[model samples]
Target: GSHMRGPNPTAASLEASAGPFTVRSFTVSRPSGYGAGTVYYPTNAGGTVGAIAIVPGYTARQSSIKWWGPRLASHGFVVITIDTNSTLDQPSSRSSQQMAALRQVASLNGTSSSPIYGKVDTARMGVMGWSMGGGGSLISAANNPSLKAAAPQAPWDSSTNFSSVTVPTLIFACENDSIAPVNSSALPIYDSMSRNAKQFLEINGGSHSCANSGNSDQALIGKKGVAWMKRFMDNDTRYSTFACENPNSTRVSDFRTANCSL
Candidate 1:
């Protein structure tokens, strides 16, 4: 398995057009212990890449968050967007399914017949999702400390005491989210994560789906997401500036970080 050092050229501008690599996607049915999913990877990355698993929120399917697959994979990460065992499942259940998706990708890396065989760096993994799935991403990080990073979009959970999570985390909060109010869901969860490197970005006057499939703030949100994963999951210090520097944009009303440097 080959590996690259530092950030690839695209890390600096995630909102720009796709990177140099041509992305290829494939479907995974009943992948090990997980439900259905789609895997995306850069055909021209020239080496094995880190992997990230993304799950959709309650009553949602893969399409809700599938945009992340190509968005992140084109930047040199192998990404898998998955459906939960049950759409009605809560955060804890979604967390388990998300981990199952990652494990399935890792298993695929060892299967000679699979297209992604030997194309994944299983040791460096991340998890992400939207709404309830977003809360589940935090839960996954808390339960799997070995995970390199996590980013949840407008998350909601029954519990906000994810103080035990040690994985680097980025929370995408929507300023005007009615479903999972920032004050109650996103902010409290971010505040409780005292043990790990974390960041909070509030999208100005946005909704619960501010960072989802058709997000209008993709330029900023997409850049932040890819940068965080590149910096932590791939251990690429070249992305530090992208991850830590304050955007100070009108789209982002507030931002905060702990143990993250510019």
Candidate 2:
């Protein structure tokens, strides 16, 4: 249903090697009562990491975010993506299931003996999600104080909101999303966060999952999204302008124009 292209055979060559960055394939045990299983892709930076977890949108697999995983890994962040309720039709259940997946990954990254081992800085972990996954990310972040940063792209509307989230978050809006209208879905979350550091970036083209596939609009949103995590997790305030100032700048609107926040 995502109008984006799947991994192209030609694009396989662009995939990052599994070294310098350790691409670990894994499955997280489902919560005791839930029978559904979850698969995850964790991109290890092979060093201390500013850990980041990405949640997929409705009906999307963990692999959907894989396109951006290596890119984030190249920037020295450990990125973990999980599949939650991909088969379920109930939106709230899917949201809760996604949160469960995050809890499991957090537990895994907490251990030193885990494959992620010394690569994850648990103290600085962040969470990002697209569409329904973004809604889950918001609710989960609002409930959990340990999360340092959160970004929800093209999030859906659920009665369950994240008005209380106090951590830094970047919410993305797509140019033509009818499902999760930007004003109703992302804007309320931005305006409701009482005192948290927050920024909203709206990409000028594509629908919901467009940001995940590195499609035309994805690059601009992705650039700012990744940079936002780095800035907050690394405590690098020098580049806060990329988030705080010109959030609506033409630079971010134009995906071809790289070197943003320079």
Candidate 3:
């Protein structure tokens, strides 16, 4: 369903703070399967768009991943940033909660009184998270291959075997991370997925929270997250380069990709 909705993308355009769509948001009064949630969506994306659910790391709240809600929604997707039932929930719990958020988003789409009524493309949903939430995203992708895309940051898991993942994924790694060292966590997780389109981007000298809410590098990280969702979730080739190409920026210390192309 290769649906192209925004202005033709360019490196500069994708790197901008906002895209073509006007964004709006609302808090979920009755949070469904997950904890608290805030839904962000484009007021007029021209047509129905995909949905993406994001989760935060251990001992974190919605603010940890709130930036992504608008950043992603403004680019033609329905996004929900959620808080887990417990901040200490593990990756598996985070994965379950992430999918529950997606289900709730889908439910909202069918509610006539909802702001996102008839707006979400449930079949093209995606996942994202930070740290353990990042591992949760990987877990969600592995267990539900039907998901269209996944992009996680500083992800960590008790187990590193996501060889079952077939959904397109982009992992954002922090080079200086001690919490989940790249060699022991992110790199091994990326290497374990051998059967899907994937990419690993390491931020130079960045910390565990580099890719989280406010550690800077938004232009690069934001562009890639949006591009990955657009390219794989909507199957839009217009964003292929932005999604798959090595950024080659001084800010990025390492990058790798496999089964990714325009």
Candidate 4:
């Protein structure tokens, strides 16, 4: 399929009553060295509003994360989903491409006529992704102050960049993602991030893509992710019941108790 131009209300009607969450797609002015791709942004009026820049894994289209946009908008978040790279066969450099896209979106939010103009609470922005994008998300969270929080699922890069990351982050890994090994992908980040507020969860039987979309392990993981952003980014402690208690546990807050030990 070609790049998604904008939100098609005609798309799958998940939560119509949640109101029309407008998602506008765009290509970053900086070429990826591949070709022009897409990114989705929830339409919102500017001012200190919370937002999320979602990065997708290889072979995954931006549309795959449609399940996440409205779910987050229902709770009042500006969601931006990007096609981090070209197709798997012609993939772009994950880190460089994602960072460029991140900067692109932030630039949009800063401009008066930008689709995301005024909608993004620049101070409360967060980054999220699956697999390769998860790795990119970690890098963004570690290095960007604009990213106050991060949620990475089935991350691909789990090197020791954790020390540079100071924001609260949540790492969701499945027991079965072979491409992005859970233990090696998240353990070091968890250990290195011990001083920073972080949550590391292991979803039993969860696969790579399954952890991003539905009520399956992926959607359940998404729910936990949404809650974490709400707590730390939106400053709505009412959602604190879903906050992670153990930085080392593989259990989600809503799925377990505060005293939950890894």
Candidate 5:
């Protein structure tokens, strides 16, 4: 893919804590649509790369999803982890901010003094979040099919009718999530997607924060997250095996995929 960045991946590379890129970040001085954000980018990704917008759950702040900022940025894509206008904002509101952040990121690319001025591929973008923000990732994908990918964790939403989402998605499910149980929320949401490439990865004995910061299994989860964004956002076939193939690991309680192939 012309948009592919960094060296060709290996299992060891994918599972490693950081990728080959040297990562850097800066807080947005004037946030566009979201409340606030920290933008992470690779010093030399070899070429222009995609950008991903990550939001936090309801009543949560940027601290909730901040781990992904440098993690994904180290893997070569520009990443923005945002704080919503209100901690209690719903998924729809988060969705609007998510896109707003993406637009702000593009604006940064046009600014000569910006750190990520020439680093972003504005056309290729992805979304991610946890809990209600995870549901907002879904809302972003459903409303904007042109998005390249989505990877939401333990999502909670007012609706589960995402049959219309055609963007490739990855759902991070927690086996024992009571707040938004996998059986009631994530699984049914996964079932609703019948038209696009999607995957459901259930963490064994995990909670609603299973895929959030301070969660165990970053080796597995990070690899999956980076691989999903790479496969879809960059059209990097090198990640197809990593992104679509089930890990069959002890950490995974359940796994299923549809409309994806090696």
Candidate 6:
């Protein structure tokens, strides 16, 4: 479809406030796996689109990280913001629910009675989250090699040995986050991911929620997140510059990448 064959102007520049497509959202209930989810997608992308599933951290709900839904959808993606089976669920459980959300969307694509029917490119998938959910994203990537991309924010895990993950990944670290310290959580996780293309962006003076709803650096973080998905999920080379080039802002404490070309 033409949407996937983009050099489409809408996705080329992340500095723009929003793209041409209007966005719509809906809810999905799945008693078998996760609780429920909110699906956000562009109303008129002229073709089917890729998707990314997002999960929230321990004791957190969808509202905490729901901003990413509109932020990514307007840029030519379908984003699902999900709730876990239990708010207290661990990273492994979160990972299972995240994948379940993607599977549900894939099923929705085949159902003629659904509004999003024929609108999802299930083969092109990505995963993201915050804190424990971020760690779950890494776990999802490790377990699902077919996934195209992963972007985890302030990830925390019992182990940082996701070296088997080959999906393109971006780790957003908060320098001042006491919950998931950059040195301990984000840094080691990024360092251990040597098998694939990856990038680490440490915010200058951010907290555990630095990349979430109330983030001051949304423009930069959102740009990178969308670019990473476009480059990897859609295989859109047009986003290569935005994905690989450093923003070089004062708000960034440290930045690192491997196998990314400008």
Please provide TM-scores, in order, for all candidate models, with all chains considered together: 0.95, 0.73, 0.99, 0.72, 0.98, 0.95
lDDT for each candidate structure? 0.86, 0.59, 0.93, 0.60, 0.93, 0.87
Give the Cα error of residue 5 in candidate 6, in Å: 5.2
Task: Please list the residue runs of candidate 2 whose C-alpha ends up more than 4 Å from where it truly belongs after superposition.
Answer: 1-47, 89-95, 110-114, 247-262
User: What does candidate 6 score on TM?
Assistant: 0.95
The alpha-carbon lDDT assigned to residue 115 of candidate 4 equals: 56
Model 1 CA deviation exceeding 4 Å by range:
1-12
Looking at model 4, residue 9 earns an lDDT score of 25
Please give the lDDT score at residue 17 for candidate 5.
Answer: 83
Ten residues in a row with the worst lDDT in model 2?
1-10
> What stretches of model 5 exceed 4 Å from their correct place?
none
Q: Could you give candidate 2's per-residue lDDT for residues 35-139 as a string of tens digits?
A: 343323345343466666666776677666665566565555666666664444344554566556555556766667565555556566677777877876777
Residue lDDT tens for model 1, 2-102: 24542454544566646556799999955765568999988878778899999898899988898888888888888999888788999988999899989
Window of ten residues with lowest summed lDDT in model 4: 1-10
Q: Which stretch of 10 consecutive residues in model 1 shows the poorest summed lDDT?
A: 1-10
Compose the digit string of candidate 4's lDDT tens values, residues 1-262: 1111123322122223343444455555654332344545556422345767676787886665556666665545666666644656221255556556555656777879765676665566777777877777787776675566787777777364567777778877676767876657765656676446677777766666556766364344545666677667865655455555432334332122222222
Those runs of model 4 whose alpha carbons end farther than 4 Å from true positions after fitting are 1-47, 88-92, 110-112, 158-161, 245-262
lDDT of 6 by residue, 129-223 (tens): 99999999999999999999999999999998898999999999999999999988999999998889999999999999998887788778888
User: Candidates 2 and 4: which is better by lDDT?
Assistant: 4
Query: What would the per-residue lDDT of candidate 3 be over residues 170-220, giving only the tens digit for each residue?
Result: 999999999999999999999999999999999999999998888789999
